[PDB]
Amino acid sequence: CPLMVKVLDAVRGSPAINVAVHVFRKAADDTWEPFASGKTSESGELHGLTTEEEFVEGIYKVEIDTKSYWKALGISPFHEHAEVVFTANDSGPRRYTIAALLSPYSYSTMAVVTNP
Amino acid sequence: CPLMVKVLDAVRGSPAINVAVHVFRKAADDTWEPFASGKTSESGELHGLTTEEEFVEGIYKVEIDTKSYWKALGISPFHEHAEVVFTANDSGPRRYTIAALLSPYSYSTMAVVTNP
Amino acid sequence: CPLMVKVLDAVRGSPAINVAVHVFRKAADDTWEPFASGKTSESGELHGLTTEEEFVEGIYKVEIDTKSYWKALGISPFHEHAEVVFTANDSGPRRYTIAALLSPYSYSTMAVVTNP
Amino acid sequence: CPLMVKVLDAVRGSPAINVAVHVFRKAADDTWEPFASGKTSESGELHGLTTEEEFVEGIYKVEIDTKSYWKALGISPFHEHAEVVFTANDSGPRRYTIAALLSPYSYSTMAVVTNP
């Protein structure tokens, strides 16, 4: 699994379930091209976004729709979404875990990068 | 001053000095128009970005060039930049402090919204 | 002022006001002696804890009563309190800012150490 | 697994390996009694600290020896250790995951609490 996203809720102490995630790749034109999307599971995780063959060198953006998450719990949050932008695989293929820790007015994001 | 940005370095326990910050406002196009920019001071802060008159309701993006900051220190970082996207609403008088705590593979951002 | 404490609420996007803070210094016993205390102001800050003369090298503990803060807001929190334990060293003149960002099931703490 | 600890390194983007963890339980005397200890694995995780039968209601402290971790990498960090203090199982047995995200001058901690 070359790309995995994990989302946690810091108000409830729980995984953040059914959060929409969109992944984009920067194209040769410098536009953001849609690459993959999905929703987190009951464990807060999103697996199966891509394969090693399709996940080439490039600049990628992971967009986490935090606003819809908090609104469905009755909270009006600060941010419109959380965005993570990074260069991937530029020294060969790697495995990436992108984690986000969500509060209404704050978020933290961490990347764990491992060499398979 | 309705909008202030503060950037901190979690590796060195210091303000993050001379970090470039770009602020964008969402246009009718759905495109991001330049709005304000500057470099953080010795205290890690950026003041003077805008005025009460010009800072109307809308969606704003604050982009922090974190990759250039780490490269100056000789540290290879994960993120291309840190982005904070939010709506400004007139709900009484509002001042916005956007803070970012930087590490090479992680960042935290917090918004403090207060009322004079 | 060699030591300042700042506490922020990530649920409400505000300073955390009237939070009790206790500071301890490590004794020869290996025991924690009361050193200073106070309640955070409307800005979430606590100033005036000590003086350059009394703040000698040592190991210090800063205890923030986060559980009482959340209970006042009607939120059931995870932690009994937040603790920050550190050594102070004379390595030139040092000022310490200890910041805590509070959520019900998470907190972040940062130290900014600067030199006048 | 009623209690699991996960430690990540925000400077290197990796699990924090071979970090010492000590767990204490507050005794009837109000002293901290040793409860369990171990070292994180190559995945940054520490499993097998306790069993459901032994993990009774109480106040627990998880102490993560961050200082030794950073010193072995050549960094002189701010904190002596990271401490997490919490009431456990007071409404029946729960499963607890305690995560810590480490930088030299900052750390974040999160708890995920699930009902088996």
Author numbering:
A (entry chain A), B (entry chain B), C (entry chain B), D (entry chain A): 10 to 125
Sentences from the paper on this structure:
Tetramer dissociation is thought to be the rate-limiting step in amyloid formation. In this paper, native MS, neutron crystallography, and computer simulations have been used to investigate the effects of the T119M and S52P mutations on TTR stability and the molecular determinants of amyloid formation.
The T119M mutation is non-amyloidogenic, and heterozygous individuals carrying the T119M mutation and an amyloidogenic mutation, such as V30M, either remain asymptomatic of FAP or present a more benign form of the disease. In the T119M structure, the longer Met119 side chain extends across the thyroxine-binding channel into a hydrophobic pocket surrounded by residues Leu17, Ala19, Leu110 and Val121. In the WT and the T119M mutant structures, the amide-D and the side-chain hydroxyl of the Ser52 residue form hydrogen bonds with OƔ of Ser50, resulting in a stable CD loop. However, in contrast to the case for S52P, a large stabilising effect on the tetramers was observed (ΔΔGtetr = −8.9 kcal mol−1; equilibrium constant fold-change of ~3∙106). In addition, the T119M monomers were calculated to be more stable than WT monomers by 1 kcal mol−1 (~5-fold increase in stability), a small but statistically significant effect. The free energy calculations estimated a stabilising effect of 8.9 kcal mol−1 on the tetramer, which corresponds to a change in equilibrium constant of ~3∙106. T119M-TTR tetramers were found to be highly resistant to dissociation. Finally, the coupling between TTR quaternary structure and the stability of the TTR fold suggested by the simulations indicates that the highly stable T119M-TTR tetramer reduces the probability of the CD strands unfolding. In contrast, the T119M mutation stabilises the dimer–dimer interface as well as TTR’s tertiary structure.
